[PDB]
Design a binder for this molecule. Sequence first.
Ligand code: HEC
Ligand code: HEC
Ligand SMILES: CCCCCCCCCCCCCCC
Ligand code: FES
Ligand code: FES
Lengths: 158, 158, 213, 213, 159, 159, 28, 28, 37, 37, 288, 288, 28, 28, 31, 31
Amino acid sequence: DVPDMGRRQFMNLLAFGTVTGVALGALYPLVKYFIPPSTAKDKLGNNVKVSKFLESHNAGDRVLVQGLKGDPTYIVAIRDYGINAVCTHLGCVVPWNAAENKFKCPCHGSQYDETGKVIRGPAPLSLALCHATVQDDNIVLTPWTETDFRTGEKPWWV
Amino acid sequence: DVPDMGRRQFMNLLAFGTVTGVALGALYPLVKYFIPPSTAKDKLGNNVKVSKFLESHNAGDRVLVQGLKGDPTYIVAIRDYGINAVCTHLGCVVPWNAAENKFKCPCHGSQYDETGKVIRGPAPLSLALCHATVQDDNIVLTPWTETDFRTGEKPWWV
Amino acid sequence: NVYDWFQERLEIQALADDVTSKYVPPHVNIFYCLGGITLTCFLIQFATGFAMTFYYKPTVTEAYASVQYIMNEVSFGWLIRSIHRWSASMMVLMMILHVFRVYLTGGFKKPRELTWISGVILAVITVSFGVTGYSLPWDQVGYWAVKIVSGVPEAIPVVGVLISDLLRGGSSVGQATLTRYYSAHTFVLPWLIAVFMLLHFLMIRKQGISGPL
Amino acid sequence: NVYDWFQERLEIQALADDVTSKYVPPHVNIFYCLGGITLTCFLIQFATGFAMTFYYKPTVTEAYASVQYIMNEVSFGWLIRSIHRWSASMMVLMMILHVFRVYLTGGFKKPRELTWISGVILAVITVSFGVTGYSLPWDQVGYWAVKIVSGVPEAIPVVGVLISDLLRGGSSVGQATLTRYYSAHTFVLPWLIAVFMLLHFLMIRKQGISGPL
Amino acid sequence: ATLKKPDLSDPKLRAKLAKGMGHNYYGEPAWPNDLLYVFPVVIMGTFACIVALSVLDPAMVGEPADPFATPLEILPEWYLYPVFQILRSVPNKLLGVLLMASVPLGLILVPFIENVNKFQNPFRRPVATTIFLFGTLVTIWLGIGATFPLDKTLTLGLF
Amino acid sequence: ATLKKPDLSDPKLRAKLAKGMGHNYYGEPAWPNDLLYVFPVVIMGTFACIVALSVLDPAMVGEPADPFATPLEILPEWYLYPVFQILRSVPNKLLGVLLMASVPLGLILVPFIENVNKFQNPFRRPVATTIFLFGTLVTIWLGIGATFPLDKTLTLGLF
Amino acid sequence: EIDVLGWVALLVVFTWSIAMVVWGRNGL
Amino acid sequence: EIDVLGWVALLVVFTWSIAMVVWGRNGL
Amino acid sequence: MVEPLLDGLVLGLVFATLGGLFYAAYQQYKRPNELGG
Amino acid sequence: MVEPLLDGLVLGLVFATLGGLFYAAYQQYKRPNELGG
Amino acid sequence: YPFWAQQTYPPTPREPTGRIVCANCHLAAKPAEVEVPQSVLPDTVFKAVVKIPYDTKLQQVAADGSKVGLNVGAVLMLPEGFKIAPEERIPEELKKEVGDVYFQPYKEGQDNVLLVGPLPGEQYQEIVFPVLSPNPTTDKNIHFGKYAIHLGANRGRGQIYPTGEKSNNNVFTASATGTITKIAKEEDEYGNVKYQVSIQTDSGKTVVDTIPAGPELIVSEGQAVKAGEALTNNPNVGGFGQDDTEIVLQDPNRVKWMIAFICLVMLAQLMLILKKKQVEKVQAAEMN
Amino acid sequence: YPFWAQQTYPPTPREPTGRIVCANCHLAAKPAEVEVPQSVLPDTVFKAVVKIPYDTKLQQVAADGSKVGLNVGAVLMLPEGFKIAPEERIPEELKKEVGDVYFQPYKEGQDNVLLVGPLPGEQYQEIVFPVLSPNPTTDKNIHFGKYAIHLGANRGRGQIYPTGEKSNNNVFTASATGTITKIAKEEDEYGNVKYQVSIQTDSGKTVVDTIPAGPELIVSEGQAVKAGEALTNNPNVGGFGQDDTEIVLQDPNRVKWMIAFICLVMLAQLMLILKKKQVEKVQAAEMN
Amino acid sequence: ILGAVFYIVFIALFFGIAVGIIFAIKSI
Amino acid sequence: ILGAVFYIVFIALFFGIAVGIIFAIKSI
Amino acid sequence: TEEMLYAALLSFGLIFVGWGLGVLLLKIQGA
Amino acid sequence: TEEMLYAALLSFGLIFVGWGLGVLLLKIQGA
Ligand code: HEC
Ligand code: HEC
Ligand SMILES: CCCCCCCCCCCCCCC
Ligand code: FES
Ligand code: FES
């Protein structure tokens, strides 16, 4: 005559179960909200005129240009690959040493090559590469798909 | 042998009295902190070239220019006085009606004159005036010191 | 056992026996929820409001463009802002209805004068939320209704202009105003309203609901 | 009478008889103040921090210039910021000394495990204050030590990059980062640290200070 | 019906009843009858309505601020309509400010006026209920008047 | 001396003492001896030192941020020195992260390890005090090592 | 006309919420 | 040399605060 | 600006609430319950 | 950056505090008080 | 004339204050109204009704002074992406309501701002706009949401020509201070009826204010009431007014999910009440 | 040479990274130090000591290969407003410590950035700067507060000339892969001693690397260790280093008020303790 | 108009569930 | 050096006040 | 004001619709 | 590191100076 624990815990599963469903449905848009939304850029971050950069801009071109994912990338006619500046160790931008022809990190002293390949220091990986093709006004940068023409195998960024 | 209430309330005045003094001395810089610190400006708010404004800028000059205390002031060779645009009622900027030669507030419909003197509507006072003298590049605006050459007596801004 | 763990430290049972010891009298109807709904509207405001502090930029050259970014580009951003607007208006409306009950049930009389007074303060705080947030998008509508109310306390003969200068951070309405208004909206008032809600709720729990009619 | 007024409503005497009923044992020395000094340092941080929200502008093109404005132009602004810096470092230092006492007095053992755990959380929260505020002036020093710590949680194989992208609001460090960091500094953490301080203090008042040595 | 009569044999309850309290010791149990089962209904209902309103009638982005251009017919939110009406209808600027501050300060004095009476039911206190209904009507009148021009705001476009 | 002996004739106090509490029922009265007279001294003293420090050694404004220019020798605040050292000394990136998270998570487990013992005095528990002094020394060592270059950070410029 | 059902959904959930409260607590 | 007295003021107020605590509560 | 839908929701609920409160007062005015007034 | 004055205040107080705590423990280790241990 | 706004104000018909510059010549004021649906779906033809009401049996003063009917005309500002629906996407019942209206974009590349007029007022008391809503799926510049629509509608002739001169639909004033003498009609065959007004006495001041035919005459003879007297009355019976509304470019997917969530809430609310009903059963079994 | 920084880098001696461009030619690295007071008053001459330490009895390699002493030189960057004190405001005891130093501003209108060198190293191990602090009262551009000071100090000759060519103070490498043959000294009367290095075998590859006099020779004969071998050793004994400190342009009024406030705190703390002592009297009278 | 039809159907569908389940729970 | 002199004088001045007032309060 | 009064009537009326709907549910189970 | 050790010694030492100063004040009144 009196509903036992089997029925008390059943309705609990029904009641508090659907309440959870509503809470989850209310949390999903809120969570996706905080997840941020997904042409080269110079100092200001607007547009890099290839007609102005090739003229007077540090003869012996080793100039930093803001590229993919905000990371600064060296732009070295022009070369095919773009040498990434962000060190693999922590994140210090690695300056180019023209007197040694090697990238030399300041925070530590791990060094690289003329192409970004690490030769010494506590740097686990080489400097990244990317397609530095020129299209119209600015410089269109597409991610490096194929294997490295420097390391010998598959890149760590693919 | 035992100190009475006269001595208990005396030391309280001494102790809690000096504590207040420290608290007040700590509050004074904090209070003065929140009290904000104490050439004409155009749309952007940088500089108004008198050589560019006199040329092509709304022939029949009745153009709003950001003047004293941020309040927009009409600049009408050039006139001596500057007609303030902020209405006395609430704060709506009063547009100039060239078809009636009178400033006419939009929010209400209180109107003024060719000099800013109120002629009708729920406007308690006339539009303010100021020295619109020209010096060097821009236009130097100094507050109107003397009496009104329009009302007949002392201005409400002095 | 997990219950026995917490029981030996902080006496958890003392709390459960304080909630299950409270009853709700028959004269308490559906209109006694208006206080809780007002609270629910704020909790919604707190969540959505916090979420918008991650994208909104309190600068005269950034504020407007940021609100567009939330509406257009941010995932479910249009919903978080739209909810934050409706929940704001609802909070004020529910609060007014909450006042209608308290007065028409005599719940403000002895010994709940302090509950009523702290309520009136809460009402002024809630309106202050609305006025400040109103001018945060820095649109034409917001800028001008904050330029009108800014000059209102200039009628006071003594401290009048000082009061106004503190509110807009100067003699006019500019970046200083928006900065101070954003501070009031997302810092000052959330703490103030949290304090007086605490006082409001504590006095209610201490004295209980008022008598019948 | 004024006392009798409040006594009939909320029983004010019940509070005064709860404070005057508490004694402090002889084994409690000067090092038992380190918890209170840590709190005092935060209250200073809260005041000065709030005051700076009236002038600081969380924008990459405004942040640096605003800090200069506070230091140079704002009345006693140099003092409010300088205090906010020293009081910040002192809070962390006093907190560490506070931990030194608790461990070297065995005040973390039964039944105060939860007090210790909530303390550890408070420690992580306080450090989070430092890291976020560190990058608010958006100077060279702040931008680069926030660009290094932003990539640190990318080592986690599963949710790693997602965690990082949430922290800096994207794949790099820009306006989105500063906006999120200013939100954490002046909204998220002040509420979090207020909650866990409340839990910290409530458990202490409930159980009292630990035994002697 | 799940009901618990008030124990009038407990002196500690009668003392609270004398001071106008202790009304949370009888009736339906708060837990779990209300707090656990009815409260989530109210909360979810409140949230669902706002959500539904936010989808069907989403927030609008106005035009960028122009300090040199005053909007045609610019109004505050609905709860500021009566105050805004007082602000613009009263000629004396200071008087309007006082009347505005009279609203919250007046409400603070309300309990210190009706403390003469112990009755709570509006019918047992007809003087207060009349003043309330009057003020409530005046408030709505001022509010609607805010939507009309200053020329026809008091008469409300009738006489 | 203003002292109140613990009433051991009260069973409710003995029960608290058995659970390790009730130590706030004896000794000097908290009010007003400490709370009213000593506490403002501590508060004012804390505030006065920070103020004095802030005037003599005021905050500095650094150079504007440059995303294309990495600072020479850029360090975090002093309390992050040991962690920063672990972060850069450990070759494996993930291992450094674990060791960093080991500091707060490890401290959480500390009470669940020394619960074997009831002693609180460091001398009556020498094993724990040794591990503490060891860790405290290691922490300082890592901290100082953060100020030195990576080549001479572990040896601390000695051997 | 999915727009119509949308507003109906608002009207219904507002109506149903009051119904569940009145039913739940036998309210007035 | 007002700069010297300034630092002295810091050293003194730090010393005096500890003295008042130790004196006040007979502390250790 | 002005929100017509919102202004309607205000008036509708205000009068309903006011009306409902007086209905609740009247119901207990005619039928006094267990020791109350 | 690095603050020399601050780094000095840290070490000075850390060692003083640590030392003072062991002094406080030793004083009660030799002289047990009213029912405590 | 709506195209005179283009001649005088090329870039936009709407001032920063939102004045809708038509009022710069049409100095009168009569109510105007725009009625659009509360919410429309993307890529959907809907009806935007513009009401320009006035007395259907009332005439104005023409250039010759002759009594002629009134022509209506309006400017409608739709949100970005909205434009006049293609002729093949308009249903038969809608085309009937529209008529022979010439919807005219304000300038090249602005199909969301339309000009209409002059149209016969007795026939076009209201104007039906066949609008096609944009599609945020095929256009990444268009977003779902609530947007504003602006309207400025006019009846009757204007008061000021684009050249700057006045017309014969408003009032006329006086020059200075003096007494009139001769009032007659100096009419021409190539021109029209005029009226000469003289000014005398005071100190010197002899001038004549020539006023065109059309306006009434409430001044008989011999008067000198300062300068600015309305001796011609106001022949204007037209009017320009403004209106503003809001349309919501609604995404059907956003409504569908909302309905689903609302259904979840209702269902979950029910389970809680049913749960309480189960608890009420148990509590009644342990009351005694 | 400090003036070669001006020739190559006109605007500023300090890169955004704060590298102090002197290192672009002086590739060595030896410790440098700048010692200024912790706080100075406005308009006050103070002493800024720059230490450029090294072994007082040690020589380097000159252009002729001859053993000569070392000359020191440094660049000091003072905060804005700071400059070399006027000659009449320098006390006698200070002028003695300074010497015949030629303080040279980096460019027109930059008296806060100074150049010094070359100076005799055996005599100027440290360099005393007679600096005059600015006055925020007479200048509204200068503010009280904590500012940064930068230093770059150098010993010995550089490695690279402004033209781009190398010098005889660093090491030398090889061209490609080959075996050497002849090692002698091709010296001239108008020139100096040279050393010829040959390359052979492999595939073709016959080249000669001429290296100037100065560097040592740790290679005897017949070797082919790739390209980049240090066959000349490193003759560099000089060094360039950097240092940074902080000076506080302190306002005396800010210190005076702080002292006053500190005195208030101490006095108020005393009154509280004395108050507790009064309370302790009363409590002991009611204990029994 | 059409909304009035939807509104009736909408509530009735859930009202049927309310009266439906309450008998399913009672009879079990 | 000079600070050591100031520090001694500074504290001694307040120490004299401490010992000074404590006897003034006791003797009254 | 078309949207205004439309919402005013609904918000007022549907309260009673829900009120009665709740009472009807009470009579079905047997209050 | 001149400013560092200078501050380290002071911060450590002046604690004892204040400690003793407090004890001396206790003996004067008669603890
Ligand atoms: C002057 C600068 C004008 C502007 C910017 C607009 N109108 Fe407009 N209009 C003007 C004048 C002087 C006349 C009468 C000229 C004549 O010879 O009769 C008109 C006339 C009209 C009409 C015709 C009315 C009728 O024939 O009864 C309409 C329909 C009209 N005007 C509308 C209109 C609209 C919609 C405008 C939008 C910007 C507009 N006008 C601008 C002078 C000016
Ligand atoms: C090249 C681009 C240089 C720069 C920017 C600086 N120096 Fe510098 N220096 C350079 C070279 C090739 C020499 C030797 C040339 C020679 O014929 O000997 C030097 C020499 C010096 C000296 C003299 C050392 C001595 O005689 O023992 C000093 C004191 C010196 N260099 C210092 C110096 C400083 C302070 C600079 C600041 C920017 C600097 N130099 C720049 C090449 C370059
Ligand atoms: C109409 C209320 C305006 C409040 C604007 C806030 C200004 C910033 C300071 C905070 C003020 C808080 C006032 C609390 C009533
Ligand atoms: S950061 Fe580049 S090596 Fe460590
Ligand atoms: S605001 Fe100008 S008249 Fe009221």
